[PDB]
Structures are given as C-alpha cells and as structure tokens.
C-alpha cells in the first residue's frame, strides 16, 4: 500500500501569504494519479487539482499543483481567507487507492483574549442526581489555550470534558467549551468552583468563579 | 449539475447489516466507475469499494466479503451492503464519482452511519445562565448543556434560527457511550430577560425535540 505522509500537519498562514504544502509517497507514483482535494469546515471533501498540476472545475487560478516520483506541491500564491480547510492528497496508480492524512490550514488574525463565562448547574440537572459546571472560553487567538478546574481551591482533573470550534469563518478567532461534572451529592460538598484560562494574551490567568452559596 | 445523494446512514449493532444508496443525476450514470470512501471520526479518507460501469467490484481487504456494492444503471443508484459490521466502520461514507485516473470529481453530501451496542437514549438540556450573584457586563453569554444522548447527531437552534449571530456551538464529545454537547449564545445586557431566549434541541434517532427556555437564576 502506498502511503502518502503530509507536512506540514498543521500550518497558520498570514493572509497574502504564498504557501507550500508537500505530500511524499512511500513508493514512486506517476503524476497522472496524484490528486488534490480540499475540504471546507462542515463540508465534503471537493477536487481541487488533478494530475499533479491541473486545476478542476471552480478552482482559483491562485492555486497550483507541483511534483513527480515520490514528491509533490500544493502551492496557494496568497492565502485567502476563504482557504481555510483541510487538504488530502491522494494516489489512484496503486490498489488500494489511499489518501495523506491532510494538512489543515488555518489562517493568522491579531491575537485576542478569550472571554470567559462559568455557568453553575441548573436546577433540572440537580433533581437527576449530577452536577455540570461549565466554562465558555470564547473568540480568542491564538488556538493554544489551558483550562484548569479547582473545588475549594484544589486543582480538579478527573470528569472534565473540552470540545474545541473549528477556525471561526468570520473573525478566525477560537473558542472552547469545557464541563466539569459531578454528582449532586458531591457539589453540595464544596461550595468554591472555578475555572482559570491560561493563554498567551494574559500575563496572568482569566479566572471566573462561583460560589455554590451565592445570593 | 451532477449531483450525489447519500441516504440509509444510521446506528446499527456490531455484526449487524446496513445497505447504503447513493442516487445520481444530471450525468450519465453508467459511463463512469463509482467509488465508496468514508472519513472516520478522526478525518482519515479510506477507500471503501469501486465498481466499474459494468459491474467489476474492487475492495480493500478490510471490507473484502463484509461489504457488496452494486449499481442499478436503471434508476442511476449506487448501493453498499454492510454487513459483519465493525465499530471500526463507524464513519461517514461518501458516494463519490470516479474518473479514468482514479481522482473523484464528484462527492455526495455524506450519510453517518455508527456501529454500537450503545442503545438510543434522547439528550437532557439543561439550562446554563449566569450565577444569581454574578455582575451585569454590557453583553450577556448565556448556554444550553445538552447531555446523556445517542447517537450523534443532535442539532442546536436558538430562538427557533432567529438568534442567529453570537452563537458557538461545539462537537460532541462521547464519554461513557452517551454524548455531551454544548452550545453558547452572547446577546446584549439589556436584551434579556426583557426578550425570550431559549435553546431548541432536536435529536432525529429518539424522534426527541426540546426547549430550553434560559431563565436568569435567583437565590
């Protein structure tokens, strides 16, 4: 089986930036079966250079496709905004047909702090027996961000669950989602619940907090 | 405007069977081999199945004697047979027009199909609005906590679809073999209580839909 190895795996690009994504073969493919595809955030992957070098249908001319043997190019002149996506390379010579396992890029925007908000659990969870405590770490850049959970002052690990949204269309900002959940019984025991957010446009952690008894 | 349409996609128990259709138009149909692939959760493209025009099949030996595809050139639908069915086939397959160099000009939409002993089981939302003595701050975030369900997917409207703006809604994420969701909503200070806000949760595989109307919390 061929296998096709991405890099870079993961790329920020400043908009107008000329960017260069390779794709190596473990074994020699001719050019007439190297294809490109691009796949959009929410969307199905999409051809977007056939045979190395050619562009399909509805492709800006901005783009541009390179190589032979084990080694091949994807070339944007000027990163727009509207490249943000995940691109695959694929071979048809060889059974089974495989794919890269893509280069996601994303693209770079001035950095802005998270806004944090912490939510206690709700009324309705507490008659079932648990107790989520969530934390919206929201429209910050860039992506790399910590969350830290502490009851009463003591750092929390176990049952806590992070999701994170893809590149924002609209701001390229990030935002993340973390829940920290327990039983009832155990919530009622403590009464300090916090979450700090680490992040690089801080000096010092965003901390929001509530106390169980608050009134 | 060729277009591919996946459908049969859904929940099925390990060693089960499903058969996936794809319907065609706007091209003609039995000059070109059509191909299954499926992306797995974690993004990764696998070849499924081909077949050629005339009816010669190809598959990975992953799939080889699990999954059949078959094409009717009659009503321009390509299918795939699951069957001994394997957690590991839990993706989302792609109906996908192939070409004589073996690139894919042509991709359906997609149909989610998961292999589980996990049962269906509809989501709690739970409301999320600030504490009672949290301090008013121009813009308000507010939230839906959508636990405990299965199988993906579940959608998250705000106000009906008229909340449009302000809203991130993030992946599921499974733990325990049910899955969590959560969505956040940020409209100005004064705009609520004054204005309704509630989250509107749909879960197609239970026939479930819910509101959750954000009411502001009192001690």
């Known amino acids: 089986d061929i296998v096709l190895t991405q890099s870079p795996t993961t790329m920020a690009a400043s908009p107008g930036e000329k960017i260069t994504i390779t794709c190596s073969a473990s074994?020699?493919?001719?050019?007439?079966?190297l294809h490109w595809y691009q796949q959009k955030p929410g969307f199905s992957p999409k051809l977007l250079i056939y045979?190395?070098?050619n562009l399909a249908s509805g492709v800006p001319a901005r783009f541009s496709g390179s190589g032979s043997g084990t080694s091949y190019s994807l070339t944007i002149g000027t990163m727009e905004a509207e490249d943000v996506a995940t691109y695959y390379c694929?071979?048809?010579?060889?059974?089974?047909?495989?794919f890269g396992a893509g280069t996601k890029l994303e693209l770079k925007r001035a950095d802005a702090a998270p806004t944090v908000s912490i939510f206690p659990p709700s009324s309705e969870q507490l008659t079932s027996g648990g107790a989520s405590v969530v934390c919206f770490l929201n429209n910050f850049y860039p992506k790399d961000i910590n969350v830290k959970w502490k009851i009463d002052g003591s750092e929390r690990q176990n049952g806590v669950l992070n999701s994170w949204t893809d590149q924002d269309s609209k701001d390229s900002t990030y935002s993340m989602s973390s829940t920290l959940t327990l039983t009832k019984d155990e919530y009622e025991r403590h009464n300090s619940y916090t979450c700090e957010a680490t992040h690089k446009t801080s000096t010092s952690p965003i901390v929001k907090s509530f106390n169980r008894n608050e009134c | 405007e060729v277009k591919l349409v996946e459908s049969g996609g859904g929940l099925v128990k390990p060693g089960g069977s499903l058969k996936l259709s794809c319907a065609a138009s706007?091209?003609?149909?039995?000059?070109?081999?059509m191909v299954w692939l499926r992306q797995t959760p974690e993004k990764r493209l696998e070849w499924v199945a081909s077949?050629?025009?005339?009816?010669?099949?190809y598959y990975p030996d992953s799939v080889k004697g699990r999954f059949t595809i078959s094409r009717d050139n009659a009503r321009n639908i390509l299918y795939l047979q699951m069957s001994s069915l394997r957690s590991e086939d839990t993706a989302m397959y792609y109906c996908?027009?192939?070409?004589?160099?073996?690139?894919?000009?042509?991709w359906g939409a997609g149909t989610t199909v998961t292999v589980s002993s996990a049962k269906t089981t509809p989501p709690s939302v739970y409301p999320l609005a600030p504490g009672s003595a949290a301090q008013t701050n121009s813009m308000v975030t507010l939230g839906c906590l959508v636990k405990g369900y299965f199988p993906e997917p579940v959608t998250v409207t705000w106000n009906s679809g008229s909340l449009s703006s302000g809203v991130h809604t993030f992946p599921a994420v499974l733990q325990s073999d049910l899955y969590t969701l959560s969505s956040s909503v940020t409209v100005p200070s004064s705009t609520w209580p004054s204005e309704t806000v509630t989250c509107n949760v749909a879960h197609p595989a239970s026939s479930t839909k819910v509101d959750k109307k954000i009411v502001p919390r009192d001690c």
């Open positions: 694929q071979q048809g010579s060889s059974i089974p047909l495989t």
């Open positions: 074994s020699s493919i001719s050019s007439n079966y």
């Open positions: 706007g091209f003609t149909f039995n000059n070109y081999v």
């Open positions: 045979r190395t070098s």
């Open positions: 077949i050629s025009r005339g009816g010669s099949t």
């Open positions: 996908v027009r192939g070409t004589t160099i073996v690139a894919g000009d042509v």
